[PDB]
Every structure is written in C-alpha cells, then in structure tokens.
Amino acid sequence: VGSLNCIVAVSQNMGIGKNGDLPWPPLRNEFRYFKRMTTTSSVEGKQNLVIMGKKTWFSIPEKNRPLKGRINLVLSRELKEPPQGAHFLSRSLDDALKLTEQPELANKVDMVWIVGGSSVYKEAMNHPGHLKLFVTRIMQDFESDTFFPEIDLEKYKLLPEYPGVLSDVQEEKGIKYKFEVYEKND
Ligand SMILES: NC(=O)C1=CN([C@@H]2O[C@H](COP(=O)(O)OP(=O)(O)OC[C@H]3O[C@@H](n4cnc5c(N)ncnc54)[C@@H](OP(=O)(O)O)[C@@H]3O)[C@@H](O)[C@H]2O)C=CC1
Ligand SMILES: COc1ccc(OCCCCC(=O)O)cc1Cc1cnc(N)nc1N
C-alpha cells in the first residue's frame, strides 16, 4: 500500500458542506481535478482506495457512485454491510487502514485517499505518520454547516508546487480558487 492522503475543497470560512451538498455552485473543473487526483495510480495493476464517512457516501450523486476506477470504502458503525454500490465497510479509520494490509487488499491498493467528512479528516490529520493534504482553496465565504478541521502549519508544510497540480489561480462561475498541497511527517 502506498501513500495516505486527504483531499478536500474548502471555502475561506472553512466550509466544506451545507446539508449534504457543497456550499458553492458546481465547479466542473474542480470536480475533474478531484477525479484525476484520486483515480490516477502510480503503480501498474493497482487502483487507489477512497475512504469516506457514511454521509459523504450518500452526498455523492448516485450516478457517480461508486467512484469509478477506485476501490470505495465506507466508514460506519450503524451499517451492517456496505451500501448499494460500495465495495467495503469498516467501523473505524484504523480498521480501514488495517484492512488494506490484509491479503484481500495489500496487493490491490496503491494510494489511499480520505475524501471526507469532517471527523474522518480530523482523525487522519492528528494521527502520527506521513500524510499529505490536497486542499482546494475556494476564495470566498460560503454559508456552510460542516467545516474542515484546523490545519496545524507547524506540522503541515505547504509545498511550493507539486507535479500534476496547477499553481496559479483558477476561476469558474465567477469563483476564484487555487490548489494547494500540504505534507507532514511525524
Ligand atoms: N467540500 C469537500 O471537499 C467535501 C465536502 N463534503 C461534504 O461535507 C459534509 C460533511 O460530512 P460529515 O457530516 O462530516 O459526515 P461523514 O461523511 O464523516 O459521515 C459521518 C458519519 O460517517 C460515519 N463515520 C464517520 N467517521 C467514522 C469513523 N471514524 N468510524 C466509523 N464511522 C464513521 C457515520 O456513521 P454511523 O453514525 O453510521 O456510525 C457518522 O455519523 C458531507 O455531507 C459532504 O456533502 C464531504 C467531503 C468533502
Ligand atoms: C466526497 O468527496 C467528493 C466525492 C465526489 C465528488 O464529486 C466529484 C465528481 C468527480 C467524478 C469522479 O470522481 O468520478 C466531490 C467530492 C468533494 C470534493 C471536491 N473537490 C475536492 N478537491 N475534494 C473533494 N473531496
């Protein structure tokens, strides 16, 4: 199993969602970036694994579920089996990461991408180890009801650039945004 990563798009006020939807109007190229980053695997014969909470899973339009070309794992203690369309279910993040080491997945998974929501991001971000955060900064305030956890910049270094990630300002639907990559190792 390869690297562990979080990927998120976040407003200036740290918003990531409002009532199970994104706080801002759809940004087509931003979604294309998410798709490209989470799907693209460095290793031949492997796929990336996406880990998400239950509410995040059900926030994805049914047409886009499961995220194609990726192994889809849902976190829940209430569910008794993976949701329709999903591949795996784990009770905890630690359990999910342990599963990747089991003979059923260790040979199949390259990168692991945590794609939400708030509590899953928080635990990953505060757990010792090598972790990258791929953060799209939506450069406006948007009314939100769930939020990205604090990024401790003493720990998370903003990288000056990263291959495959544009460094300049993007704009769709009159909304400016930019792509960032953070890395810790503790
Ligand atoms: N802008 C962006 O980049 C992103 C935005 N979002 C949006 O943000 C909203 C935020 O979602 P949020 O409310 O945080 O919900 P989550 O997706 O984290 O789902 C919360 C639920 O997930 C299960 N869960 C979460 N963590 C764990 C864990 N460690 N172990 C076991 N089960 C877990 C649930 O199940 P249970 O009660 O069944 O045990 C818990 O009630 C989403 O609705 C989505 O629309 C989501 C991702 C990215
Ligand atoms: C839960 O995170 C997401 C999951 C899906 C999603 O839709 C993207 C459609 C792309 C098509 C595909 O991947 O096949 C959007 C999100 C939210 C999200 C958006 N942007 C970034 N940078 N990170 C996210 N987690």
Domains of the chain by start residue, with CATH: 1-186 (3.40.430.10)
Which pair of structure tokens corresponds to residue 71?
């192994």
Residue whose C-alpha is closest to residue 63's, from 105, 18, 16, 31: 31
Alpha-carbon dihedral sign for residues 59, 141, 121, 44: positive
CA distance 155 to 126: 10
SS3 99: helix
Residue whose C-alpha is closest to residue 86's, from 121, 45, 58: 58
Which residues form the catalytic set?
Answer: 22, 30
Which pair of structure tokens corresponds to residue 67?
């995220």
CA distance 100 to 127: 17
* Cα R_g (the chain), whole angstroms: 16
- Please give the span between the terminal C-alpha atoms of the chain, in angstroms, as a whole number: 19
What is the DSSP-derived secondary structure letter of residue 20? T
* Number of other CB atoms surrounding residue 141 within 10 Å: 12
CA distance 60 to 38: 15
For the CA of 22, the nearest atom of ligand 2: 17
CA distances from 142 to 4, 15, 18, 31, 146 (A): 29, 7, 9, 18, 11
For the CA of 136, the nearest atom of ligand 1: 3
Pocket probe mutation, ligand 2, options 47, 115, 134, 177, max atoms within 8 Å of Cβ: 115
Give the amino acid at 72: N
Name residues contacting ligand 2 (CB within 6 A).
7-9, 30-31, 34-35, 52, 56, 60, 64, 67-68, 115-116, 136
Give residue numbers after which the chain breaks (C–N above 2.5 Å): none
CA distance 113 to 102: 18
Give the amino acid at 140: Q
Degrees (nearest 5) of the Cα angle 69, 75, 78? Answer: 135
User: Which ligand is nearest the CA of 146, by number?
Assistant: 1
Which pair of structure tokens corresponds to residue 170?
């993007």
Q: Resolution of this PDB entry, in A? A: 1.5
For the CA of 121, the nearest atom of ligand 1: 18
Give the amino acid at 15: G
Question: Which residue has 């708030």 as its token pair?
Answer: 118
CA distances from 92 to 28, 51, 73, 77, 118 (A): 32, 10, 11, 8, 14
Which pair of structure tokens corresponds to residue 18?
């409002």
